[PDB]
Amino acid sequence: CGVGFIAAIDGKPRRSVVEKGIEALKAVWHRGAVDADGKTGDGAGIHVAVPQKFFKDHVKVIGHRAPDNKLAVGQVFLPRISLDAQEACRCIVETEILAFGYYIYGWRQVPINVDIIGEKANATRPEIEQIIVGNNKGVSDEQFELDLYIIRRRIEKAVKGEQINDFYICSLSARSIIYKGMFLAEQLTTFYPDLLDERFESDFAIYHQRYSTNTFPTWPLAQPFRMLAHNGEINTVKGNVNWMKAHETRMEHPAFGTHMQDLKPVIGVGLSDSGSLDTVFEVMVRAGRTAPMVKMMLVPQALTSSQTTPDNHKALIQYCNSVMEPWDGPAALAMTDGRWVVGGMDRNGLRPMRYTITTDGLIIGGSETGMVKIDETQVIEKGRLGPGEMIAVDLQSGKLYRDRELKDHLATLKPWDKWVQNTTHLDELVKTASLKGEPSDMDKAELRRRQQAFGLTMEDMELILHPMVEDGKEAIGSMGDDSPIAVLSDKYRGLHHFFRQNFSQVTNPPIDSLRERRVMSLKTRLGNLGNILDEDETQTRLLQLESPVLTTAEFRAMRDYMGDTAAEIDATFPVDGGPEALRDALRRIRQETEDAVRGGATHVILTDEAMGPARAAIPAILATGAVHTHLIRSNLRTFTSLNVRTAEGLDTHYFAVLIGVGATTVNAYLAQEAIAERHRRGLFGSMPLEKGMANYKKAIDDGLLKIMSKMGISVISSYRGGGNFEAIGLSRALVAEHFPAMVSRISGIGLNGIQKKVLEQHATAYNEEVVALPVGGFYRFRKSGDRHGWEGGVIHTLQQAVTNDSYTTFKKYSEQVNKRPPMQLRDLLELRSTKAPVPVDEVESITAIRKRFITPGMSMGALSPEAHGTLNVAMNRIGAKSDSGEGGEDPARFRPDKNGDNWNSAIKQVASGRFGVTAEYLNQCRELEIKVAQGAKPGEGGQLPGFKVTEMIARLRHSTPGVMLISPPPHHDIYSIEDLAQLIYDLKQINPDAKVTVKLVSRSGIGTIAAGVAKANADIILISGNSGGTGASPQTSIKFAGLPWEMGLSEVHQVLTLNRLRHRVRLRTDGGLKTGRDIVIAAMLGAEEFGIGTASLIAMGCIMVRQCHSNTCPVGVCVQDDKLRQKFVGTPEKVVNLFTFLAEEVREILAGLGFRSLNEVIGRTDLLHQVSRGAEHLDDLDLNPRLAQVDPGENARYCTLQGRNEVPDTLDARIVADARPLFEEGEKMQLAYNARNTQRAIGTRLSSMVTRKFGMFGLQPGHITIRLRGTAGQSLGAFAVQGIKLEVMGDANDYVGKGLSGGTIVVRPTTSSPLETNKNTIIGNTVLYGATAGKLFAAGQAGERFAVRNSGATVVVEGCGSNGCEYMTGGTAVILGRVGDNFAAGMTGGMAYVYDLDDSLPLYINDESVIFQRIEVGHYESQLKHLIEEHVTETQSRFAAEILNDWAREVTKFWQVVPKEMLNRLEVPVHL
Template sequence: MTRGLYSEEFEKDACGIGFIANIKNVPSHQIVADALKMLHKMEHRGGVAADDKTGDGAGVHIQIPHNYFQQLAKQEGIELPAKGAYGVGMVFFPMLNTQLFESILNAVLRQLDLEAFWIRWVPTRGEEIGDFAKSNEPYVRQYFIKSTDAISGRELQRKLYLFRKITEYKAKGLDYAKEFYMSSCSIHSIIYKGELRTWQLDEYYPDLKDERLVSAFAIIHSRFSTNTLPEWRLAQPFRYIAHNGEINTIKGNINKMRSREALFSSTHFTKEEINQLLPICNAEFSDSANLDMAVELLIMGGREIERVMAMLIPPAWRENITLSKELRAFYDYHATFLEPWDGPAAVCFTDGNKVGACIDRNGLRPTRYSITKDDRIVFASETGIVEIEPSQVLKRGKLKPGQMILVDLVENTFEEDESIKTRLSQEFDYQKWNHELITHESELARDTTLNFKLETDELLKEQLTFGYSKEDLKYILKPMTTTGSEPIGSMGNDAALAVFAKRNAHLSNYFRQLFAQVSNPAIDPIREKAVMSLAVYLGQSNNLLEDNDPTSRKILLDQPVVKPALLASIKELSGEHYRTVELSATYSPEKTNLKESIKELSKQAADLVRGGVNILVLSNRPKTGELSIPSLLVTGAVHHYLIDQGIRARVSLVIEGGDVIETHHFATLIAYGASAVCPYLAFETLNSISEPDQVKEAIDQYIKAIGYGLRKILSKMGISTLQSYESAQIFEILGLSDEIVKLCFKGTPSRISGK
C-alpha cells in the first residue's frame, strides 16, 4: 500500500554532457585534464543538495590506461596481460555487509571460468564530499579480470557482460544491494563517477590527476535531477552512454523489452546464458540507465554502436520525402524491431573503439562541436566550454534534429551524419528484407464497402448499453465529421471528477494524461507534424539479437483506427505468417462475475498465443444474456497477463469496442497495449446521423479527427510516434480501487484510490 502523494515515477532530470577525443587515437593526459575542465565548467548543470557539497552526480568515461595500471601492478609484483586480454571492473561495495557481496562476486567469477588476478583498492579522498554523499559512500575497487580459457576481445567482453548481469541478479534484494554496483566492466574503458559535484570528481579520485593516466577520449556528465534523491549508482556516464534529456516512453519501453525477452536467441550466447542475462532492463534505475542497458544488449548481440543508436533514437523519417530508398528501407526495417525510445535527448556514446553523439528527432537538446588542426574533437551540450584558439579550429558544427557524428578510433576517422547513415543503409539489402517481412494494410484483400449491421432499434439499444448520450452525438461525433478535428470547447473542465460523478462515468475518465514538464518541452502537433507518426505494426515481435528473422512478419497500418472492412480482413487471416482469433469480451452474470471473467479471458488469450495466434481481436459486442466488459479493462488485463506469462511479444491486440468514441478513449486503449482499434458502434452511429451519400466522408473525417487528437495528446508529453506511445501507460489514475489497478493497469500511479 502506498502512503502519501510522492511517487518516484515522476522523477525527472536534465544534465550537461560532452566528450573530447583524439581522432588519431593518440592517448594523452591532456585529453583527461581538458575533459575535467569541461566538467568543472558545467557546474551550473549539476544539482546541489542543501549541504552545498553533495552533488546529483558527476563522472568521466575514459579508455583503460593500460600503461598506468601496468606500472602500478608491477609495484605489487603483478604482470598485466596484453590489451584486450583482460578487463577492469569498477565496483562499488557497500561499507556494511561487504564480505557477502565479495563472496557473490567471486562465486560468479568461478562459475564463468574467470579470474580476478588483481584487486586494487581505488584511492579516494572523501573529506570534501557532502554529508548526504558520505552517508552512502561505497568502497571503490577495481577488479582486473582475465579468462582461465585464455579468451580475449569481444568474446571476453561478452563474458564480462554475463558476469556483471549474473552478479547483479544474485545481489538483488539483499540488504544494501543498492550500494553494490559495477559502474563499468570492460576490456576497453573505465568509468570514474559518484554522488559528487563537478569540481569534486578529480579531488575524490586522485587517479584522475596523475599525469601517467592517459586516454584518447573522455566522456563527461554533470547530473541535474529536478526532484530525485541522488545515488552513487545513478551518476553518469553509464557503461555506453551519457544522456541529457528524458525518455518519455520509458515505462512502455521497459514493458516491451520484458515481453520480447522470451523471443531472444543468439549465436553469441547459449539459451542458458540468455536466461541468465534477464531481465535486460530494471525499472529501479533511471530512464537513462535503462537506455544504456538496451544499448548494451544490442551491441552484445553483434551490432555496431552507431547502428544501435540509429535504431533506438531514429530521426523523423516517415514524412521525409528526401530520404533515399535505401535509407528509408533501413529505418522501416528497424521500426519493426523496436519502437523509438522517445523524448528530448542528447547522447554521447562509446563502445571503447568508437565515440560519438546523437540527438533526438526534434533537436530539443542542442549540441555543438569543434574539430581542431591537431586532430581533436570537442563536443558538448553548450558552446565555449573548452577554450580553443580560433586559429586552431578546423571546423565547427552542430547536430541538427536526428543527426549523429562518429569518431572511429581504430580507423582514425571522423564521420558526419549523412556518411554514417548512407553506410548503414547499404550494409544489408533492407529493401529485399522489407518486401519479404512487411505487409502494408493496402495489400490485404478486402471489401471496401461500408457494411453496417445494426437496425435503428438495435443501434439505440447498444448506444444505451455503452453509455452514449445525446451530447456525445451532438457535441463530439457530429463536429468531428464536419471539421475533421476535435470539437472546440472552453479552456478547462469544470465537470466533476469521474469518481464523484452522479452518472456512471466512462472508465477512461478515471485516467489523467501526464504532460511535459520541467525541461521537457511539448511538441506543436500542427507545425511540427512532420516529426510525428501514427503508424503501427501488427504481428509477432522480432528477435532483437538476430537480423532477418523469417518468423517475424508485420502488417503495417498507417494509423490505428481500423474500419470494419479492414477489421474483417484481419479477422480472416489464418495463413503461415499471420493467424487471427477473435475473443468475445462478454460474460454471463448468472455464471460468473466481472473479475473472474476477466481472469478467464486473459487465460484464454494466453492459451491462444501459445498455440500460434499472433493477432488477437478483443471484441465487446453485446451477446444475448451477457454483459460487455469495458474495452479498456479487458485490454489492460490481457496485456499485463501476457507480459507476466512472458508471451506478450508474440501477439498484437486489436480492439473492437462499442465504448470507444472520442480521442481519449483511443489514447488509453493504445497506452495499455492495443495496437489498433475499431470503434464499430461509433461508425454505426455516424451512419445513422449522416446523409446516405456523406457516410464515407463522415467516417474519413472522424478518423482524421482522431488522428489529430492523438497527435495532440502525444505532443503534450513530448512524444513523436504512436509506436512509442503504445503500452507506455503515461497516465495517472484517480479514483479506481487498488484491486482493479493491480489486475488491469499494473504499474500506473494511483495515489488516491476509490472503491
C-alpha cells in the first residue's frame, strides 16, 4: 500500500511528473500481499491530467479537427459480460452528455494487456472504454467540470434506476483522468500502455496501491478516487454517513442550479470508506470550496487550546468544526480540486507521509521515502507531515505553500473570529446554577422505589456510583465477566446491557485518552445543522456545551434559556395498557416529536419523569433511537437538538449508548438524586454535594472520551448517532426498525418481551413498600440472585478434584456446571450425532489432546512469581505450552533446573508497552503472540497498579519501581494492516523458528480482519471471548466490551474459509472454557487450540474473591506482597491434573459421538443443534448464522505442510553470508551495501544470529559494522543487539531501532548532500519504540512519536515530531532542536535534555509527569556534553559541532527534562 503525489511547483506540465508517478508505484510492493500467483493484487491507480496532445491527435486521426479548447474524456467500466447491458450503459452515457448539448467524438477501447491479471480479477474485470467529449458550447474550464459533474451523477443515477450492475465511471473531466485497476502497481504500465506514451505529460500526479481484508477484487474500489486518495481508514464512517443523511436535507447551493436533487444522495451504496469521503469532498469542491478548505472542513486538525496555534487558524478551525463533523481515522491523503494539489494528515498523525523538494521545481509526496530516485545533489528540502498538517501547491500560480503559510492563507479568507464570536457558549451560564446548588427533591422513600424500577442495587451504589463521586474516576475491578449474557439472564437487565461497545483491532489503532486527551473532545452544539454548502457567518449561530453531560442544575439552566423553543415528550407508558402498550407508546412519541418539530420546535426533551405506579418507563435507549431515527427518516433531525432525561441511567456505558444512538444531551437525574441521599449520611464526608456532582461529571466525561478512543475516535460529534454498538440479544427486526445501523447477528427479544420484562420489574417497585435495594451479585457472586460460572460450590469441587486427584470429583464438578440453566450461547446447543458410539480406549490419547491446550498469557506482575512459574512448569511437563504474558520473563529461567523442571515459557507475548522485549526474550521461544487485545478490555491495554511494580518487576520491565504501568492502548507500530504485516515480518526475522500469533477479540467484523491477518503471514489466530479474565481493568469493559467466542470464532472460521485462507492459519480460542464440552463445542465451531486461564488459576488456588487489583490476595495468586505470597499452595501437579481431566472428559464425549479424534470434528458444526428455549415468553435467538457451513458436504483437501507461513529474505541474507568469519572465527568486520526503501528489517536477522551465538552483549560495540548508502525501509536495525552497528549514509523510514537492544545505529545525510542537517527530517516515526539498550545517532529530525516507550536506549537527534519521548521509562534522550506538541507525556523515567533556542519548550511540553529546569548540577551538564560529542564523532554533524564550540553560552540554552517520580530516586540530585 501507499499514497503519493507529485507536482511541478511551477504549474507547467511535464512528462517526468508522470514518469515519476509510475516510478513510485514501482516501489511499494514490499508492503503488500504477494500472491504465489504472481499477478493478483488489491488495486492501484494513477490520477493524471487528461493529455490533450494524445487525445486531440486521436480525434484528428479519425479525421476530425482538434478543437481549440480542452477536450474531455469519460473513463468508464462497463458490464463486460452482458452486451445487452453495455448498450443500455452507453445509451445512458450518451443521452446524459447529450442533453447538456455538448459533443461526442465517440468511444475508444482502451488498450490493456490482460495477461498480467489473475483470474479472480479477470473475472470481475469490467470492459474499460473511453468516451471523448467536446466543449462545443464554448464554456469555461470551470464550467465544463461543473457540467460534466452534474452529468456523471445523472448517469450514475439512471444506471442505478435501471438496476444495472458493474457500471462505473472512474473519471470524466477535461482536467483529470484516472487510470486505476486491479493489478500490481509495479505493473500499471503493463496493463495500460497509454501511460507509456510521451504525449502523457502533466503538472501533477496522485498514485495509490491498497490492501484488503479480502481475496475478492472489485474494480471501482481501487483508488485514486476522483479528487482523493487515502492511506488509512476512517473509523468514524458510519457516523459521517448518517450525518449526511441530514446534512443533505438542507444542502442547496446555486451552482447546481435546479440540479441538486439529482445530486443526492451524495453517498451511494457499495462505496469503500475512502470512496465515500471523495464523494463528499467532491460536492463541496464542486460548489466552490478550494481543496485546502475542504481538507479542513472534513479532516480538521485538533484545536488543542494552546499557544502552539496562531489565533487566525483557531478561528477557522472553530468555524469548520461547527459546520461539519470530522471524518476521523488514520489518514494520509493526496488531494486535488482542479487547481491545487494537497498532501494532508489526520488529526493524530496516524500514517507516514514523507516528502522531498527538488532543484527542478517538483515536490514528490510519499508514504515511504526511497520511493523514487533523486540525486541528493538536487534536494532542496526533505520534510514530512505531522498531525493535522498539509502542504500544497497552487498550480495556477505555481506557488508552494507549507503548512503555516497555507493555513495563514485560509485564515485570510473570511472574518473567521468575528464570525466565530457569534456563538452562545451556554457553559458558564450552566456552571453558575450548579454552584448555586445542585438540588434534590425526592424522599429516600422514592429514590428507593424508582431505583427498584430499573432494578438497581447496593453493589450499584457502593461499587460503582460511589467511586465516581469520590475519586472522580470509574470503578476498577478484576477477574472476568462470568455472568450470563443478558438475554439469557434471569434478572432484569437494562437495554444498555445488550449493546456492546465496539472497538478497534487491526484496521485502526485506538488512542490514549489519558496521555493524549488534548486531541480529543466532547463539545456539543444545539442547532448548527444547516448548509454544509453555505459559507456565511450565519453558521455560527448555535448554543454550545462542552459535554453532552448535564447535572440537574445545569440541565434546567438550559431548558430555560430554551423555553418556547423546547418541547417535552413523555417517554412513558400505561401498564393498564395491553399487550401493545409500549409499541403505540413508541409510535406516539415518534409522532409527537414530529408535530413539535414541524410546529416550529427546536429542541426536544424526552423523559421518564412521569414514571409512576400507573406508568412504566420506556427504555430511554429505545426511546431515544426510535426518535432520532424517525427524525432522520423524515428529514427533521436537522431541525432539533434531542435531549434526554433518564431515571435508569447511572454509568459511563449508558451515556455512550444513548449518545451514539442520537442524544445530544443527557441528564442522569435519578442518580444525582441517589448521590445526594448518600451524601446526607455523610458518606462523602466533608465534601459539598456540588463538588460531588462535579466529580461525577468528570468521571462520566472521561468516561466517554474513553469508550470513544476504543475505535480511535477523537470527537463526540462524529461519534454521536453513529450507532457504534453491536446488539447481542435483541431482535433483528427491532434493531433495524429503531436504532441506527447496528448488527444484531441473532435477533433476540422484541417489544413484546421488552414490554413484559419492563413491567415486571415495575410491579416489583410499585406493588409495595421498598426500604432497601437488594444487594446485587452482578459484579460478584453473592449467594443471592445472579449466578456466575465460578461460584463457590463449583470452585470447591474443582479444587477438591485437582487436589485429591480424583477424576470422579472432576466429573461431579462439571456436572454441577453443566446442569444449570443456560447462561452462555453454547449452553443452548445439544450435541447429537449419527454414528454409534465408540469404545473410549479407541480414541486419541490424553497426551495427544492435552497438547492442544495452553495456559494463556497472564503477566508476571498481575500474578505472583510463584503462580507464574508454576504454570510454566506444568505446561512444559506435559509437552504443552504456556504464555509469558504482557510483562517480561526472567532469563535465569532460560534453563531446566536440577529437578528437571522448566520455568521458561514457550510462547512469549509482544504487547503495546513492550515490557521485557528483548533480542534474547524474543528468541527464547517457539511462538510469538502479538497481543492486539483481551476480552476483558478490548479497546485498551494493560494496567499494573504501582504497588505491584515491585523492584524485581521493575527490573524485568525496565520501568520505575513502584510507579504504575498503564500501557498504550494501541501498539505504536501497528496503525493499519500493512503495519501488522510488517511487525510480523520483524518478528519472523528476529526469530527464525517461531510461529506468530495474533490475539484478537471476538466481535462482529472479526472475520474479515481475520483474513487480512492471514494474508499478513500470521500462523495462528486467537479469538478471545468477551468474558475472559484480567488482573486489573475498569468494570465497564468487563461487562460491556467484547462478544461471546461462539460468534467471533465461527465468523473467523467462516470468512477465512470463504476466501480460501482457512488452512493457512491455525485457530485458537479462550474465554471461560472450564469444561470438557466447552472444548468440544469450540472445536466444532472451528477451533484447533483452547486456552485455559482462570480455571487454571483456581486449581492453583484462586478462590475468586476478586482483589487482584488490590495486592491483597488471600492466596498468593495475584499479589506481589511477600507475606501474602507465602500463602500460595499452587502446584504443577495441580494444574497438570486440571488438564488431564479436561482432556479425558473430551475423549469421553467424542466416543459418545462416534469420533475417535478431535480433528475429525473440527468445523463439524453439523454435530450441534440449537435447542434451548429457556424463558416463559416466546422470545428466541437464532443460532444459525453460527452453525452454518460455508461449503457444506465434501471438502477438497489443500495440502498444508508442517511449519510456519515463511517469509522473504532481506539484506540480512547476504550480510550473514558475508559474515562467515564473524561466526566462524570471531573476526571483526566492516561491510558495505546500498539500501533501498524496499529493504525491511535490515540487521534484525543478523541480530538474531548474533544473540544466538554471543548473546545480546557478548560482543564489543562495533564488532560487525555495516555501512549503507541510500534508504533503509521500515524497521531498520530493529532488535539489534550490541556488536552490530549500522551506518546509514542517506536516510530512513519508520521504526528505526524499534526494540533496539544494545546495538548501535547512526544515520546522516550524504557527505555530498547540501542539506542543513537540522532543518530536515531524516527518520520516520515510532523510532526506538520500546528499546532497552543501545545508542542511536541522527544528523536530522525525526517524526512523530520519537522514542516512544524507550526503555533504556540513548539517542541524539536534531529535532522531532510531536508526541515525543511519550511513555518513556528509561534511557537518555538528547535533542538538538524544536520539539512537537505533548512532549514527554507519561514520561515516568529516563531523562531528556533539549536544546531550545526560543524558550518555547514551555509551550509544548506535557507537564503532568515531568519537569524541566536548566542544567544546574554539573554531572548532568557533563553527561550531555559527552553525548553530543559522541553524536558529532559519529555523525560529523556541523550544527552539533558548533554547539560544542560555544558550549559556554549554549549549555545555557538546553532544558533538563526529568520525571517527577525520578527526583528522589536519583543517585546524584538534579539540583544544587
